[PDB]
Amino acid sequence: ADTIVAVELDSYPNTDIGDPSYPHIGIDIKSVRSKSTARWNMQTGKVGTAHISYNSVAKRLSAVVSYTGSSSTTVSYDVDLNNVLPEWVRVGLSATTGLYKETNTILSWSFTSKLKTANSLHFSFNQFSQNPKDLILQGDATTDSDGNLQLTRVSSDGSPQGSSVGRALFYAPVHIWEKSAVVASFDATFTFLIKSPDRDPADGITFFIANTDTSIPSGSGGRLLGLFPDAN
Amino acid sequence: ADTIVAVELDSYPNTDIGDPSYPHIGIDIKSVRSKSTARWNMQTGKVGTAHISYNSVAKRLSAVVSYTGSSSTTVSYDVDLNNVLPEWVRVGLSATTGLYKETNTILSWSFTSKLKTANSLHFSFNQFSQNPKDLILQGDATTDSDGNLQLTRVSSDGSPQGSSVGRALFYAPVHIWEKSAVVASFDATFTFLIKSPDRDPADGITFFIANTDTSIPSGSGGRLLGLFPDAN
Amino acid sequence: ADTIVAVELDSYPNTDIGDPSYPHIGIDIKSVRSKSTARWNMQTGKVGTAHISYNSVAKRLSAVVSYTGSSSTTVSYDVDLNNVLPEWVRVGLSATTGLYKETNTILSWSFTSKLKTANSLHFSFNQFSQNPKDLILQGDATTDSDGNLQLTRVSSDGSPQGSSVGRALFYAPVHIWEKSAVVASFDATFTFLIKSPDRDPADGITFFIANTDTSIPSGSGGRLLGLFPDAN
Amino acid sequence: ADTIVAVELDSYPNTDIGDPSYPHIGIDIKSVRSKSTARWNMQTGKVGTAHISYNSVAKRLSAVVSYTGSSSTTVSYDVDLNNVLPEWVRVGLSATTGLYKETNTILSWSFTSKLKTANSLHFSFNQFSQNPKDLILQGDATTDSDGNLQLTRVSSDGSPQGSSVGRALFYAPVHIWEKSAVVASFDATFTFLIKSPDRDPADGITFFIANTDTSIPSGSGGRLLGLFPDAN
Ligand SMILES: OC[C@H]1O[C@H](Oc2c[nH]c3ccc(Br)c(Cl)c23)[C@@H](O)[C@@H](O)[C@@H]1O
Ligand SMILES: OC[C@H]1O[C@H](Oc2c[nH]c3ccc(Br)c(Cl)c23)[C@@H](O)[C@@H](O)[C@@H]1O
Ligand SMILES: OC[C@H]1O[C@H](Oc2c[nH]c3ccc(Br)c(Cl)c23)[C@@H](O)[C@@H](O)[C@@H]1O
Ligand SMILES: OC[C@H]1O[C@H](Oc2c[nH]c3ccc(Br)c(Cl)c23)[C@@H](O)[C@@H](O)[C@@H]1O
Ligand SMILES: [Ca+2]
Ligand SMILES: [Ca+2]
Ligand SMILES: [Ca+2]
Ligand SMILES: [Ca+2]
Ligand SMILES: [Mn+2]
Ligand SMILES: [Mn+2]
Ligand SMILES: [Mn+2]
Ligand SMILES: [Mn+2]
Numbered sequence: 001a002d003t004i005v006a007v008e009l010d011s012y013p014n015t016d017i018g019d020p021s022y023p024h025i026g027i028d029i030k031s032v033r034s035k036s037t038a039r040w041n042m043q044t045g046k047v048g049t050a051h052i053s054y055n056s057v058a059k060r061l062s063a064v065v066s067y068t069g070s071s072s073t074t075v076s077y078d079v080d081l082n083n084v085l086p087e088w089v090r091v092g093l094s095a096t097t098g099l100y101k102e103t104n105t106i107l108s109w110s111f112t113s114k115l116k117t118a119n120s121l122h123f124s125f126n127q128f129s130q131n132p133k134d135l136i137l138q139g140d141a142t143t144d145s146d147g148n149l150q151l152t153r154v155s156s157d158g159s160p161q162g163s164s165v166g167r168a169l170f171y172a173p174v175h176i177w178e179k180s181a182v183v184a185s186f187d188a189t190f191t192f193l194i195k196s197p198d199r200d201p202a203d204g205i206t207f208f209i210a211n212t213d214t215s216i217p218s219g220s221g222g223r224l225l226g227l228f229p230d231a232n
Numbered sequence: 233a234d235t236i237v238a239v240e241l242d243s244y245p246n247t248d249i250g251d252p253s254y255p256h257i258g259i260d261i262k263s264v265r266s267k268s269t270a271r272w273n274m275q276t277g278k279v280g281t282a283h284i285s286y287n288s289v290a291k292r293l294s295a296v297v298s299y300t301g302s303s304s305t306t307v308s309y310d311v312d313l314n315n316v317l318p319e320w321v322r323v324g325l326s327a328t329t330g331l332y333k334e335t336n337t338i339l340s341w342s343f344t345s346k347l348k349t350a351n352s353l354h355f356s357f358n359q360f361s362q363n364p365k366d367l368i369l370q371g372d373a374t375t376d377s378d379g380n381l382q383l384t385r386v387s388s389d390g391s392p393q394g395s396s397v398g399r400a401l402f403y404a405p406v407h408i409w410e411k412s413a414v415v416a417s418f419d420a421t422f423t424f425l426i427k428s429p430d431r432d433p434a435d436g437i438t439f440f441i442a443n444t445d446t447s448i449p450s451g452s453g454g455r456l457l458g459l460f461p462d463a464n
Numbered sequence: 465a466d467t468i469v470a471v472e473l474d475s476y477p478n479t480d481i482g483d484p485s486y487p488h489i490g491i492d493i494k495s496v497r498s499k500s501t502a503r504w505n506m507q508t509g510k511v512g513t514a515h516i517s518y519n520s521v522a523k524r525l526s527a528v529v530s531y532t533g534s535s536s537t538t539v540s541y542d543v544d545l546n547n548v549l550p551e552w553v554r555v556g557l558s559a560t561t562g563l564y565k566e567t568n569t570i571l572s573w574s575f576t577s578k579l580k581t582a583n584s585l586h587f588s589f590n591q592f593s594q595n596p597k598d599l600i601l602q603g604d605a606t607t608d609s610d611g612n613l614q615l616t617r618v619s620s621d622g623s624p625q626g627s628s629v630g631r632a633l634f635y636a637p638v639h640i641w642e643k644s645a646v647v648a649s650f651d652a653t654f655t656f657l658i659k660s661p662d663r664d665p666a667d668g669i670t671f672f673i674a675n676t677d678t679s680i681p682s683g684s685g686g687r688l689l690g691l692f693p694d695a696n
Numbered sequence: 697a698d699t700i701v702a703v704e705l706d707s708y709p710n711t712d713i714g715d716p717s718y719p720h721i722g723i724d725i726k727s728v729r730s731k732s733t734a735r736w737n738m739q740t741g742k743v744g745t746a747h748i749s750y751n752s753v754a755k756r757l758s759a760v761v762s763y764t765g766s767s768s769t770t771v772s773y774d775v776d777l778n779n780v781l782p783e784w785v786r787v788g789l790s791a792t793t794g795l796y797k798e799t800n801t802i803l804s805w806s807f808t809s810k811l812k813t814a815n816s817l818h819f820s821f822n823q824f825s826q827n828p829k830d831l832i833l834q835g836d837a838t839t840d841s842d843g844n845l846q847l848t849r850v851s852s853d854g855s856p857q858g859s860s861v862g863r864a865l866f867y868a869p870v871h872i873w874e875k876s877a878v879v880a881s882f883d884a885t886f887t888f889l890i891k892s893p894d895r896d897p898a899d900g901i902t903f904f905i906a907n908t909d910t911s912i913p914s915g916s917g918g919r920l921l922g923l924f925p926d927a928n
Contacts, residue, residue, distance in 0.1 A: 049813070049878070051878065053881065057758040057760045057770050057772065058749060058754055058772050060754040064878055066813070076754050088366075116885070117745070117762070118359055119357050120354065120356050121354070121366070124351065124352050125351050126350050170404065172366040173365040173366050178361065182745070183747050183760050185749065185883075189812070212365060283580060283646065283647050285519050285521065289515070289526040289528045290517060291540075294519065294521040294522035296521045298581070298646045308522050308523075348515060349532070414515065414536055419649075582822050582823055583820065584818065585818070585830070586817070587816065587817050588815065589815050593874065595784075597871070598784075598868040598870070635869065636819070637867065642825065
């Protein structure tokens with residue numbers, strides 16, 4: 001299977017697969033069952049910002065998801081990523097809807113990786129082109145006429161659809177560790193807009209890092225956020 | 233054919249296709265016959281550094297190739313690139329040898345493109361991996377066990393071979409212009425080592441920007457630096 | 465006197481000191497009488513963005529001032545800055561009002577200088593603190609309770625005042641050239657808001673680079689944009 | 697007194713003030729008595745590199761000091777810096793010698809701070825000017841004719857002197873936290889050369905962050921690394 005490290009913004013509590021009973025953010029290391037989570041007071045219809053960081057000395061993957069003036073939710077997990085992930089990876093955003101639904105709209109995304117002693121990679125998109133040639137769009141993901149990356153299916157009127165999954169990967173593999181590296185670090189930020197007509201919107205957005213040839217796993221819809229073939 | 237904009241570090245004077253009669257640096261806009269050139273006092277066996285810059289307001293593509301303490305050769309050409317090139321491009325280095333030869337070794341390469349009003353892309357390599365997954369290596373290009381990108385064929389003992397061509401492209405397409413852009417800029421630097429046993433080494437190195445699906449043209453060896461199908 | 469290089473966003477045409485007869489942007493090299501200007505369709509009450517760039521190989525100082533969806537005004541001037549300016553400088557924004565007036569509000573400012581072969585400096589402010597300890601505020605300049613840098617005096621109700629001058633300098637000197645530099649480049653962007661009740665607002669905003677110990681010259685009000693002691 | 701957070705590269709074990717009995721790196725939060733230390737196999741006469749990072753979500757200040765091919769020493773400490781330090785700070789390097797001595801030569805130094813939701817500051821020096829106008833040199837610190845920052849006194853022949861203290865601060869205050877910040881991060885790297893004729897070289901180098909008006913405390917020589925007025 002793929003190897004996945006992700007920060008999930010999990011709008012829908014699947015308590016039967018170990019979610020806490022409230023929307024949350026989480027760090028997922030090779031499992032949808034987050035190694036650490038924090039309650040997330042999700043604000044439907046407001047633009048959120050997630051900042052994710054790691055470096056290989058501190059070995060603490062952290063994320064903060066905020067909405068202006070209202071909340072900032074943080075979660076951290078200690079982990080040596082460079083023992084979990086392959087040396088080369090692709091980085092991406094995923095999102096799903098399931099029985100319930102929400103827009104999983106990405107308005108901007110930036111990422112920086114540095115490998116020091118050697119390499120760096122930085123990209124940032126404050127809008128997305130109609131044909132984002134440097135994105136690998138998987139499943140339902142497309143960019144819309146406003147320049148937004150719609151991870152999951154939305155109709156022409158902007159309404160979200162259920163049973164959707166989409167991911168966008170940055171086109172270049174990222175060399176996130178090498179044997180002779182002194183320290184490897186990455187930072188990612190994206191802003192997102194989750195709107196939903198559903199009382200319990202679902203399912204959420206992740207920023208994820210995986211093997212380069214990552215693809216949406218069969219069976220990864222809904223609660224598995226397009227990342228995992230099962231809930232193990 | 234491809235659309236090519238390049239800065240060439242042209243070690244070998246092909247005066248029959250319009251080179252000046254001395255090694256030179258040049259700016260090539262859709263032709264091997266540089267729109268502008270400057271004499272280049274090439275220093276075989278010393279590590280050189282090239283810095284190339286452009287922005288769409290100034291519309292002046294400039295390059296400087298230097299060697300520590302000995303020379304700095306500059307060439308500039310006024311050109312609206314964003315009318316020459318497609319909106320999406322790949323950026324790359326090329327090099328060739330022909331009847332005569334030289335190592336066309338790249339020790340580091342960095343590139344930054346920004347599109348403002350929106351996007352940026354930056355990569356830098358101070359060494360290259362044995363399997364540079366974020367490079368598209370074309371023709372003869374490989375990375376060597378010292379971490380160098382050898383654009384053209386070198387033998388196990390490091391000796392350069394003739395009739396070689398190689399290019400390395402950055403894996404991600406780069407969005408170097410969009411209609412609604414206020415200004416688009418790029419900068420590139422690479423350091424290189426050209427060694428040769430030949431009295432008149434050849435043929436040279438370029439940094440080039442092309443259509444995304446650029447490939448080495450048939451017939452582009454030697455004097456055409458792996459960039460053009462002919463000398464027109 | 466100071467040595468000044470500036471890009472002026474000159475809202476008020478002082479045709480008696482060589483302004484064109486319309487609002488314009490200009491590049492000023494040691495004189496308020498711009499070496500080059502472009503007509504600027506100034507949009508009072510809308511937020512503008514200026515991007516200024518230079519590098520010492522291309523030797524073309526360029527600026528573009530835009531407002532979203534309405535205009536982009538560009539001006540360029542060929543000049544070897546590193547023969548005009550001292551090796552160390554301070555960079556700043558200035559603005560003035562005179563008999564007529566306008567707000568000269570700066571909402572963000574970023575600047576990057578690189579000296580290559582060696583040094584870089586980058587700062588960016590997307591809002592300004594109540595006590596911007598890394599700004600040297602000269603004359604009337606202050607930051608306001610919205611986080612804006614008000615270059616020239618505004619009253620508590622936000623109304624601009626006449627006969628005002630203010631500048632903000634970045635606190636650190638910037639080493640913008642050294643003898644052994646291969647190339648020196650800088651980029652600056654700032655966004656600004658010029659509002660005025662006056663039919664002919666005045667006087668304008670500049671981004672400027674000067675000797676480190678630059679101060680507002682006596683007599684530099686109004687048309688001289690806080691930069692020059694006279695109109696020579 | 698000043699408020700000091702530092703990463704110390706402590707070449708000399710002052711076990712009477714709580715040093716471990718071997719050269720070490722340490723994180724010091726308002727005390728010379730490190731909150732955390734790691735054994736440092738100091739390599740006199742070889743160029744070392746220190747990378748220090750922090751961000752306010754992870755709240756883990758980490759440092760790694762390495763020498764090519766021989767060692768990489770890491771130390772981390774969990775700490776909410778933005779509760780320890782003032783919102784505005786100066787960042788600097790310090791070094792001392794005492795009864796014993798060593799060169800505390802800085803060959804390069806870079807620093808990046810970002811405050812997000814807003815501001816960033818980055819500087820890097822790969823050599824230092826004879827008159828580093830953007831450094832506040834305190835005590836003995838000077839730059840030498842090779843472009844190195846000699847924190848502590850060295851004679852014309854390059855030999856280190858005892859009873860020396862010197863610091864260099866970056867000239868601009870750095871806004872490292874604000875109430876409304878979502879996350880604040882900083883990274884610093886410097887490379888250094890510690891040479892000594894002494895069997896037990898002393899005393900060490902730090903990178904430190906302090907109140908803006910920080911100055912070398914009286915009594916801060918030798919073991920107190922120019923940072924603290926006493927060993928408490
Ligand atoms: O809201 C999105 C969620 O919808 C689905 O599961 C259910 C959520 N509420 C339910 C109610 C009834 C039944 Br049966 C099902 Cl499967 C569900 C599942 O598809 C989950 O994986 C997904 O996270
Ligand atoms: O040195 C590299 C050069 O070698 C070739 O051409 C010649 C260079 N010197 C010559 C001498 C004789 C003859 Br015939 C030829 Cl084709 C050449 C050609 O292959 C050129 O395109 C290339 O630039
Ligand atoms: O609007 C700002 C301008 O106001 C002043 O000059 C005048 C602008 N309109 C005028 C009308 C009459 C007279 Br007298 C004067 Cl000095 C002026 C001068 O202060 C100019 O330097 C300044 O640019
Ligand atoms: O080597 C540098 C060290 O020299 C000094 O202390 C001594 C180190 N070795 C000693 C031996 C004897 C005596 Br007395 C003293 Cl004070 C010392 C002190 O100055 C320490 O603060 C400093 O770290
Ligand atoms: Ca869930
Ligand atoms: Ca040639
Ligand atoms: Ca004027
Ligand atoms: Ca000690
Ligand atoms: Mn979850
Ligand atoms: Mn040529
Ligand atoms: Mn003017
Ligand atoms: Mn210690």
